[PDB]
Design a protein around this ligand. Structure first.
Ligand SMILES: CCCCCCCCCCCCCCCCCC(=O)OC[C@H](COP(=O)([O-])OCC(O)COP(=O)([O-])OC[C@@H](COC(=O)CCCCCCCCCCCCCCCCC)OC(=O)CCCCCCCCCCCCCCCCC)OC(=O)CCCCCCCCCCCCCCCCC
Ligand SMILES: COC1=C(OC)C(=O)C(C/C=C(\C)CC/C=C(\C)CC/C=C(\C)CC/C=C(/C)CC/C=C(\C)CC/C=C(\C)CC/C=C(\C)CC/C=C(/C)CCC=C(C)C)=C(C)C1=O
Ligand SMILES: CCCCCCCCCCCCCCCCCC(=O)OC[C@H](COP(=O)(O)OCCN)OC(=O)CCCCCCCCCCCCCCCCC
Ligand SMILES: CCCCCCCCCCCCCCCCCC(=O)OC[C@H](COP(=O)(O)OCCN)OC(=O)CCCCCCCCCCCCCCCCC
Ligand SMILES: CCCCCCCCCCCCCCCCCC(=O)OC[C@H](COP(=O)(O)OCCN)OC(=O)CCCCCCCCCCCCCCCCC
Lengths: 103, 67, 79, 96, 96, 317, 112, 91, 344, 155
């Protein structure tokens, strides 16, 4: 940062834990670990100005693993229209929604 | 003499054992004669739930090698 | 030393207090068992030991963990 | 005595942790098998819910990657019975 | 989700508070704390649903620093109602 | 069923709570060469029910006091006491709060609000002083009270009170950790405002600040609360430090043994009250920020090192 | 789309025995049947997707069922006694039942 | 839920009693010294909060570290307390 | 102060900015800011005069709410990116919060009300620390995040500060507050070039530190918090009259002295970036700052104000000397201009 | 009841609203206590236990306790009713805003490891002692200094 007394001294008191994909206790990976890696091994050697346009696929995805809003949206739509189909008595949960199953 | 403080205590004691015997038999009745499973960690809740699915709806019912 | 003595007899809590502070700061350093703590806790198998690809030149536990090769806790046993 | 008792207790703890270590493989399969079923079952209903909706890809990864992103709890039980969803969501915090 | 917008607005409602004194220093020092709770709750919430355990240290470091911060704040407050017999802010107008 | 298991675990305790006052007004009596209450009912058994009915019938005076807070404090008090009995680990505890001891610690702390608010609400000078004095002593005794438990837990492995039944299958935690038992017992005496430490309602020194204005039904509820606590804290001593015998086959033995030890340690604070004059306010706090807190801190270290250098780390189950 | 596998693709015989049953035989199952499981684990790890190891999972299950069929055929009674006592305990702790465990363990050593 | 059920019965039982009570019978300090103690409390409470995690830290593979870290925590705060005494702040 | 306490505090007031600068995990940057807040408050009330308690209670509330706002920005980022640190993607509002907050701790522009008042009630010494070793910390956080902050806001806070600082200073006669006002102004220039060339912010700061530190140790040599008080400098200690003259004109931008370089290169960098609107207005009111600087010049040097007989008594006694730092920081400041190319 | 979470958030917001209205310092402390309670509830709702407890034994504990103590000393003089009124005013406005989006508990516990054995709150914060060993050193220095800051500022 402003004064890199850490890299110089070789110590790493503040870097080991800045992102989700960093070592998790007892090797229990955190959520989204599938993308942040893909979005930071991409932006490594490429500065930000160019980590912001071409490495946009990996952030647009990582912006969706975490926020997980497009999913919310899709699902919400499915919910609303399903309400309308039920409204037209077209649809009602099958035993698929409610039934016995494998261990 | 001091013989008399005992009456009162008796009714305290009897009222402090009820709870411990009661809670520990309303558990072995509701859970089918088997101590209520203590699910401290998820694994245990999983195993417990798995049991539910395995038979009836209640986990206490326990299927065996003959299944 | 003399104060120590009276201290043992007057304000005899601090004396005991400090003494313990130290004895806890020493026993760990000298103990035929201190090492075990980091092992006994290390060993507890909380997480699943994912297998390894038997590519070749493997001195690791041979398949069935019942095979001789591999780490052992006989140290834990008969401890 | 405390030193010896906890050392024994530790031996028992390693024994049963290893017992699941052995049994989790059987469960892992079971979980995945069932998990997929829930996703697929939701697909069926999915292929029957928004059919009328125009411009409606039956389903599509909210993401672009084709990597297998595990199913959130909601996704698995969202369409399903409320209780089912609640159980999963508030079913541990609430003891047996 | 929305849960976060309530907490965030809680912090803004607490923001509007600290920035609009009402003649009671203590009350302010109490509003200020309302934020720290909202920040602590939000930090803990996201850390918990990101399963980011490496970060849980922070939710608490936030509280530990905030507690002392408040300790200093109250000692100033006690200092003021020792010099002016009240915590009322109007009194604090000598530096004009 | 679960409801029935709520009657049991409550009523039974309430009925026992009533019989403690009686066994207090007789054990203090015989110690002071007097029979105690035996004329109402047979051997005074109906005596606790009798004043309960008088107390509720007498007018609940509402001094000309913040009504809401004035009335809430009693409610909180009783609520907390009855609640703290929910997770106690008598065999098959009503509710296996995984972090039970923390829960106990938490609710125990909340009680302080009652006394504080009561004094503030009462609006009487005596009450105000009582609250101030009470809050200080209460919280302070909480600081050593909590550290003493943390030392225990680290030798138990978990916060769940149920684990100690498995920790104490060979020896009571008094043998080890006796130095803290004493310090848990004295702190249990402070937190229940019992005698050696009862400056909250000294009566002689200041006249019952906590309930100076409280009478009839409000008096009773705290009242009930204090005595239930008197038992609960003694019961926590009888699980954490004096571990009753336990057998999975026969779970009753534990309850029975739990009974005997709880009654004797409950008898002990009754015996302490008659036997000792009351500590001064300053003296009381000194003992804890000065006589004990340094003792409690140091042993904490010893109990941190003990497991490691003895490689006696406990299982986390 | 999502390429979620079909049900017929994921239908296979089920163990379905009370968790207690498993915990009692856990040790032996960890013994007689870890060949396939470890391999399945390898697949499920390196190949992140589950669809990429489904078939292996089927093999995983097949290995245990017979494990059980063997025990059912031989020393069933011992095992039955061991699990019933193990199940009664709330955390199904192994040490409460050691006498039943010994007879179950000795027999299958003797026969299986 | 099970806890919620118990607790609301607990409040209900109390609220019932207070009501019965009211409905049936129809027929400036200068605690400066204290202030200081109160602040120390706040501080010590916070330490305790940093000492609460030990029950799980005792399990850390890095046992030694945990020892050093923990020992420091208690020791440093102990020093703070002693200072109070040394400076005679509390007295 | 029990010398031990003095050490703990001073260490914290010094560990405070240093942790901020060294760390990258923003959180650790926040606590660096938090430690500075806690360490400075004890020193501020050292006299414990009624004015002082007012000073600290203001400084603390202003500092505390800003600290909480900075934390909120870090907490929000944590949700918009798992990282604990600002990135290209950061929501614009997230960064703007950090600008406002950090511009409150540094006291720039419309949040410039606390500084003049706390500079008035604290000693001259703690005045320096409150003005210059407490600006390093927040500025570090900004300089690190410069690529991402808004050019518009900074400029507005920059211009505002310049104006407020200048206008405020014209009326003030208390020295502590004249300096507080100057600092607001210089702080403004610094934040103007941050979005464009952070490296110049670090020059417009050092030079401000190398100018203000000698200026304050001058004000306290005779401990004069009044211009009338500094005006009798000619009797109390005549030599410092020469350099006090040049340092104050150096604080304003007049060309031969070192003080021109920061304004000159900031203007060169802004014109290179095309802000010839903004730069022009800033330079113009910058000229207002020199007017109040020269008005003080008049009273202290160019004209000799009447003094008191009791002053002859203070002359007799040997004057405790000014530390060496005064000289080394007076010359390196009044005249280094011939060496500008290397400085930048 | 999926709404459980939203309900809680609302309560929290309302409590902070009261604190915002700045009632008597004691009323403020009480309000915060309620909010802190709501807070631990929400955290626990997600699954974090140790975390929820902390706020309780720290805020619902002394954090407000000392405040309380404090107020007794510096707050003597008791429109709270009017404040209560504005509070209801805010409540409805708050509700109105949610009703705004009304015209226009689905996903919590977003992801979970059904089988897991060493995952639980506190474990992560337990790593203050290992692999995060700079948080707790700086916090300890914070407390050790704060002792000194308060003792002189009171002096
Ligand atoms: C754009 C630039 C504009 C510049 C001018 C304007 C800016 C500066 C204005 C300064 C004055 C402003 C008004 C101040 C208040 C005036 C009234 C007042 O109260 O004064 C009382 C005050 C009373 O003090 P005092 O007790 O009489 O002190 C005796 C003096 O020190 C005198 O002591 P002395 O005479 O007994 O001792 C002799 C000594 C006197 O020593 C000094 O005083 C030095 C002062 C340096 C000041 C620098 C300021 C910049 O001679 C020397 O300087 C050393 C000579 C031997 C070494 C030579 C080294 C190599 C030099 C090579 C050439 C250098 C120039 C070219 C560069 C090299 C080639 C490329 O009067 C002063 O002393 C003023 C001192 C400063 C004079 C600066 C003149 C700078 C001219 C340019
Ligand atoms: C030395 O003389 C004194 C005593 O007698 C020896 C005391 O014990 C005590 C202790 C307290 C008392 C004044 C008397 C004790 C009170 C009682 C008999 C019971 C109080 C009644 C209640 C609050 C509720 C009773 C009813 C129920 C529990 C019903 C539950 C269903 C003191 C302070 C005292 O002055
Ligand atoms: C080496 C490894 C680490 C272990 C090291 C162990 C070293 C040996 C143990 C040393 C400490 C043993 C005692 C611990 C508790 C006492 C702590 C103490 O110091 O007492 C404080 C206080 C007496 O202090 P005071 O007389 O005022 O003079 C102070 C002089 N500094 O005490 C009091 O005044 C108490 C007043 C009590 C009033 C009521 C008394 C009731 C008595 C009957 C009940 C006693 C407790 C019963 C407990 C039952 C089980 C829980
Ligand atoms: C009046 C105030 C005092 C009320 C009594 C004291 C309440 C203390 C609550 C402590 C927090 C709850 C807790 O610690 O355990 C709850 C338990 C989850 O704990 P855990 O062991 O992890 O279980 C999961 C694995 N089986 O299982 C649960 O999570 C149960 C659901 C949460 C219940 C929390 C307590 C509910 C209290 C309800 C009454 C609240 C009254 C508030 C009054 C103020 C105005 C609103
Ligand atoms: C107020 C309170 C202030 C407290 C200030 C504390 C300042 C230091 C805090 C972190 C201390 C970390 C110590 C690590 C020690 C260690 O890892 O031990 C290994 C090695 C030798 O130790 P070993 O052979 O195990 O002997 C121990 C016998 N019981 O030891 C070594 O050779 C060195 C190991 C270094 C490990 C990396 C440390 C990186 C920096 C950590 C943060 C501290 C930064 C500087 C402050």
């Amino acid at each position: 940062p402003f004064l890199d007394i850490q890299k110089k001294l070789g110590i790493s008191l503040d870097r080991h834990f800045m992102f989700l994909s960093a070592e998790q206790p007892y090797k229990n990976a955190a959520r989204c670990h599938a993308f942040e890696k893909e979005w930071i091994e991409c932006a490594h050697g490429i500065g930000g100005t160019r980590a912001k346009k071409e490495c946009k696929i990996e952030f647009d995805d990582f912006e969706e693993c975490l926020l997980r809003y497009k999913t919310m949206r899709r699902m919400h739509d499915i919910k609303k229209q399903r309400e309308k189909l039920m409204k037209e008595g077209k649809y009602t949960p099958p035993p698929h929604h409610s039934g016995r199953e494998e261990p | 003499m001091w013989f008399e403080i005992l009456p009162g205590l008796a009714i305290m004691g009897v009222c402090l054992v009820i709870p411990g015997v009661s809670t520990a038999y309303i558990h072995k009745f509701t859970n089918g004669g088997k101590e209520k499973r203590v699910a401290r960690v998820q694994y245990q809740w999983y195993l417990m739930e798995r049991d539910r699915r395995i038979s009836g709806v209640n986990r206490y019912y326990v299927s065996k090698g003959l299944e | 030393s003399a104060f120590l003595k009276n201290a043992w007899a007057k304000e005899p809590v601090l004396v005991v207090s400090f003494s313990v502070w130290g004895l806890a700061i020493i026993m760990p350093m000298i103990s035929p068992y201190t090492k075990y703590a980091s092992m006994i806790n290390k060993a507890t198998p909380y997480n699943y030991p994912v297998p390894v690809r038997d590519d070749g030149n493997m001195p690791d536990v041979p398949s069935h963990p019942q095979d001789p090769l591999g780490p052992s806790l006989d140290w834990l046993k008969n401890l | 005595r405390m030193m010896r008792w906890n050392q024994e207790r530790r031996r028992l703890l390693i024994e049963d942790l290893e017992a699941r270590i052995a049994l989790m493989p059987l469960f892992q399969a079971e979980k995945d098998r069932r998990t997929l079923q829930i996703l697929r079952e939701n697909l069926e209903e999915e292929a029957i819910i928004m059919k009328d909706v125009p411009n409606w890809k039956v389903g599509e990864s909210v993401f672009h990657t084709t990597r297998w992103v595990p199913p959130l709890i909601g996704e698995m039980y969202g369409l399903r019975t409320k209780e089912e969803m609640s159980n999963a969501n508030f079913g541990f915090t609430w003891y047996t | 989700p929305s849960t976060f917008f309530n907490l965030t607005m809680a912090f803004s409602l607490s923001l509007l508070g600290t920035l609009m004194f009402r003649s009671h220093l203590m009350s302010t020092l109490l509003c200020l704390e309302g934020m720290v709770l909202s920040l602590f709750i939000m930090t803990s919430v996201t850390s918990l649903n990101s399963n980011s355990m490496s970060s849980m240290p922070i939710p608490i470091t936030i509280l530990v620093f905030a507690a002392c911060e408040a300790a200093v704040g109250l000692a100033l407050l006690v200092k003021v109602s020792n010099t002016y017999g009240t915590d009322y802010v109007q009194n604090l107008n000598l530096l004009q | 069923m679960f409801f029935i298991n709520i009657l049991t675990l409550l009523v039974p305790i309430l009925i026992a709570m009533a019989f403690l006052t009686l066994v207090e007004r007789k054990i203090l009596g015989y110690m002071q060469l007097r029979k105690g209450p035996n004329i109402v009912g047979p051997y005074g058994i109906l005596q606790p029910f009798a004043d309960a009915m008088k107390l509720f019938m007498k007018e609940p005076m509402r001094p000309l006091t913040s009504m809401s807070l004035f009335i809430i404090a009693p409610t909180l008090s009783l609520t907390l006491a009855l609640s703290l009995w929910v997770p106690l680990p008598m065999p098959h505890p009503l509710i296996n709060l995984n972090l039970g001891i923390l829960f106990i610690l938490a609710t125990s702390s909340l009680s302080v609000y009652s006394i504080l608010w009561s004094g503030w609400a009462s609006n009487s000078k005596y009450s105000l002083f009582g609250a101030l004095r009470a809050v200080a002593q209460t919280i302070s005794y909480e600081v050593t009270m909590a550290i003493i438990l943390l030392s225990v837990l680290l030798m138990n492995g978990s916060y769940s009170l149920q684990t100690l039944i498995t920790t104490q299958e060979h020896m009571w935690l008094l043998l080890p950790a006796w130095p803290m038992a004493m310090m848990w017992f004295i702190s249990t005496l402070a937190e229940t405002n019992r005698a050696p430490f009862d400056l909250t309602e000294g009566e002689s020194e200041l006249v019952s600040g906590f309930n100076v204005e409280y009478a009839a039904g409000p008096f009773a509820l705290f009242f009930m609360a204090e005595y239930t606590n008197i038992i609960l804290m003694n019961a926590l001593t009888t699980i954490i430090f004096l571990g009753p015998l336990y057998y999975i086959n026969l779970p009753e033995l534990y309850s029975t043994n739990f009974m005997m030890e709880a009654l004797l340690l409950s008898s002990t604070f009754l015996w302490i009250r008659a036997s000792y004059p009351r500590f001064r306010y300053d003296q009381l706090m000194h003992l804890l920020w000065k006589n004990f807190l340094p003792l409690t801190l140091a042993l904490c270290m010893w109990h941190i090192s003990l497991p490691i250098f003895t490689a006696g780390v406990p299982p986390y189950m | 789309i999502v390429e979620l596998p079909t049900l017929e693709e994921l239908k296979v015989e089920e163990v379905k025995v009370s968790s207690a049953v498993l915990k009692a035989a856990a040790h032996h199952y960890g013994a007689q049947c870890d060949k396939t499981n470890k391999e399945f684990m390898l697949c499920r790890w390196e190949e992140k997707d589950p669809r990429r190891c489904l078939k292996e999972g089927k093999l995983v299950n097949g290995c245990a069922l017979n494990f059980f069929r063997q025990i059912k055929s031989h020393c069933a009674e011992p095992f039955t006694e061991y699990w019933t006592c193990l199940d009664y305990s709330n955390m199904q702790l192994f040490r409460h039942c050691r006498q039943q465990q010994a007879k179950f363990d000795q027999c299958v050593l003797d026969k299986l | 839920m099970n806890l919620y059920t118990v607790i609301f019965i607990n409040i209900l039982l109390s609220l019932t009693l207070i009501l019965v009570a009211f409905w049936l019978p129809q027929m400036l300090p200068f605690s400066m010294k204290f202030f200081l103690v109160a602040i120390t409390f706040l501080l010590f409470d916070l330490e305790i909060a940093l000492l609460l995690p030990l029950p799980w830290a005792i399990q850390t593979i890095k046992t030694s570290t945990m020892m050093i870290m923990a020992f420091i925590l208690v020791t440093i705060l102990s020093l703070g307390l002693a200072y109070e005494w040394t400076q005679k702040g509390l007295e | 102060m029990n010398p031990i306490t003095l050490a703990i505090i001073y260490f914290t007031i010094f560990l405070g900015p240093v942790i901020t600068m060294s760390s990258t995990n923003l959180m650790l940057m926040w606590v660096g800011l938090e430690f500075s807040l806690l360490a400075i408050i004890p020193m501020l009330i050292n006299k414990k005069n009624p004015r002082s308690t007012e000073a600290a209670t203001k400084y603390f509330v202003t500092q505390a709410t800003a600290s909480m706002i900075i934390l909120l920005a870090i907490v929000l980022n944590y949700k918009q990116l798992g990282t604990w640190m600002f990135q290209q993607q950061t929501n614009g509002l997230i960064l703007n919060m950090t600008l406002m907050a950090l511009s409150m701790k540094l006291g720039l522009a419309p949040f410039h009300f606390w500084l003049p008042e706390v500079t008035q009630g604290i000693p001259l010494h703690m005045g320096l620390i409150l003005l210059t070793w407490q600006k390093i910390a927040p500025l570090s956080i900004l300089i690190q995040i410069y690529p991402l902050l808004n050019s518009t806001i900074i400029l507005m806070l920059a211009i505002t500060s310049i104006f407020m600082g200048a206008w405020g200073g014209l009326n003030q006669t208390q020295m502590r507050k004249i300096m507080a006002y100057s600092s607001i102004a210089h702080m403004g220039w610094m934040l103007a070039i941050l979005p464009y060339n952070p490296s110049l912010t670090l020059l417009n700061l050092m030079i401000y530190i190398i100018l203000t530190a000698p200026m304050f140790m001058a004000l306290m040599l005779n401990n004069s918090m009044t211009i009338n008080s500094i005006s009798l400098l000619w009797n109390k200690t005549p030599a410092m009259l020469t350099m006090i003259s040049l340092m104050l004109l150096s604080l304003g931008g007049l060309p031969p002295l070192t003080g021109f370089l920061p304004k000159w290169i900031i203007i060169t960098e802004l014109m290179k970036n095309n802000c010839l609107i903004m730069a022009t207005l800033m330079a113009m009111m910058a000229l207002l700052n020199l007017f109040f600087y020269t008005r003080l010049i008049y009273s202290t040097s160019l004209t000799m104000f009447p003094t008191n007989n009791n002053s002859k008594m203070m002359t007799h006694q040997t004057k405790t000397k000014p530390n060496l730092m005064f000289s080394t920081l007076a010359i390196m400041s009044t005249m280094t201009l011939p060496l500008a190319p290397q400085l930048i | 009841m999926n709404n459980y979470i939203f309900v809680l958030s609302s309560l929290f917001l309302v409590g902070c609203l009261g604190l915002a209205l700045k009632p008597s310092p004691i009323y403020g402390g009480l309000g915060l206590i309620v909010s802190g309670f709501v807070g631990c509830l929400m955290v626990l709702g997600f699954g974090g236990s140790f975390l929820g407890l902390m706020v309780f034994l720290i805020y619902l504990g002394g954090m407000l306790v000392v405040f309380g103590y404090t107020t007794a000393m510096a707050t003597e003089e008791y429109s709270n009713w009017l404040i209560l009124g504005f509070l209801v005013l805010g409540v409805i406005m708050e509700v109105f805003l949610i009703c705004v989006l009304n015209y226009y508990g689905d996903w919590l516990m977003y992801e979970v490891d059904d089988v897991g054995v060493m995952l639980e709150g506190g474990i992560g914060v337990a790593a203050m002692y290992s692999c995060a060993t700079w948080m707790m050193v700086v916090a300890g220095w914070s407390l050790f200094a704060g002792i000194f800051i308060i003792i002189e500022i009171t002096r």
